[PDB]
Design a protein around this motif. Sequence first.
Motif, short mmCIF file in Angstrom:
data_model
loop_
_atom_site.label_atom_id
_atom_site.label_comp_id
_atom_site.label_asym_id
_atom_site.label_seq_id
_atom_site.Cartn_x
_atom_site.Cartn_y
_atom_site.Cartn_z
N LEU A 113 0.77 -1.06 -0.20
CA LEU A 113 0.15 0.01 -0.13
C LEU A 113 0.75 1.45 0.21
O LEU A 113 0.56 2.23 -0.77
N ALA A 114 1.99 1.22 1.06
CA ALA A 114 2.79 2.46 0.90
C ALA A 114 3.29 2.64 -0.38
O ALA A 114 3.71 3.63 -0.84
N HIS A 115 3.76 1.40 -1.05
CA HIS A 115 4.53 1.75 -2.46
C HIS A 115 3.79 2.47 -3.44
O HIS A 115 4.27 3.25 -4.05
N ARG A 116 2.55 2.08 -3.40
CA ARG A 116 1.48 2.69 -4.24
C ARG A 116 1.43 4.28 -4.04
O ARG A 116 1.26 4.91 -4.82
N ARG A 117 1.51 4.65 -2.73
CA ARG A 117 1.68 6.12 -2.41
C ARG A 117 2.61 6.71 -2.79
O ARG A 117 2.45 7.89 -3.16
N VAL A 176 8.94 -2.33 -9.88
CA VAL A 176 9.18 -2.57 -8.48
C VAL A 176 10.69 -3.02 -8.57
O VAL A 176 11.25 -2.67 -7.51
N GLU A 177 11.10 -3.59 -9.44
CA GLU A 177 12.41 -3.91 -9.56
C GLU A 177 13.35 -2.79 -9.42
O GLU A 177 14.58 -2.91 -9.14
N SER A 178 12.71 -1.58 -9.80
CA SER A 178 13.57 -0.25 -9.53
C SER A 178 13.17 0.53 -8.20
O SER A 178 13.93 1.11 -7.85
N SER A 179 11.99 0.40 -7.84
CA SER A 179 11.55 1.07 -6.83
C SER A 179 12.31 0.49 -5.47
O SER A 179 12.65 1.29 -4.58
N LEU A 180 12.42 -1.04 -5.46
CA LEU A 180 13.10 -1.69 -4.37
C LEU A 180 14.55 -1.43 -4.67
O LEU A 180 15.32 -1.74 -3.57
N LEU A 217 8.89 5.57 6.71
CA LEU A 217 7.32 4.90 7.12
C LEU A 217 7.31 4.27 8.36
O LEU A 217 6.34 4.29 9.07
N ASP A 218 8.61 3.17 8.61
CA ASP A 218 8.39 2.55 9.70
C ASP A 218 8.58 3.30 10.99
O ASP A 218 8.10 3.09 11.70
N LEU A 219 9.24 4.55 10.89
CA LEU A 219 9.27 5.17 11.94
C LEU A 219 8.10 5.96 12.45
O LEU A 219 7.78 6.21 13.65
N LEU A 220 7.33 6.30 11.19
CA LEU A 220 6.03 7.04 11.57
C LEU A 220 5.14 6.00 12.07
O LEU A 220 4.54 6.14 13.33
#
Length: 184
Positions: free
Chosen positions: A22-26, A38-42, A85-88
């Motif tokens: 979900l976060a990835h989409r945002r 995705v192979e580029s986002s990650l 995002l994890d921190l939030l």
Amino acid sequence: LSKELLAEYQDLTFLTKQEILLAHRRFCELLPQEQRSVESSLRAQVPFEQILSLPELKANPFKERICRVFSTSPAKDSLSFEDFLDLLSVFSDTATPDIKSHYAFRIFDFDDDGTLNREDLSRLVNCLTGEGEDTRLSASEMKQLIDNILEESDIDRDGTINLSEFQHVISRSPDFASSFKIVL
Ligand SMILES: [Ca+2]
Ligand SMILES: [Ca+2]
């Protein structure tokens, strides 16, 4: 609880599947839709400014230290939406009394060294008061303020507050104890 064990959790234990998807989409919309791969986002990080798109953590007088300390990078020129995002989310609810202090003491120490000086305390209280004003600022009055608190709170009068003293001194008197509600 040292910064070690924490680093172990940051590895691949705080990254779920639904939150990441979900976060990835945002974070994708904010980034070129053409690079939805995705192979580029990650395999690629997220620009610094891109993160600033969340005035939420910005309200933090030290959003640079919180992210830099919480995040990890070679030249610290890039920021991952994972740790950010994890921190939030983590500081959203998971913020348990235990992890609460640990995280605080770490963020509280402006020098990010470990110990706390009269300045560090004059930074959290001031910044919150109203950064950019003659309000509660470092001065003669503020000098005796911290000293008085240290004497009334801590006895060793070591002249500084450590992790052990921080947890107590903070929750040792209605002073910061009441304000210790939520800080960041
Ligand atoms: Ca310090
Ligand atoms: Ca002390």
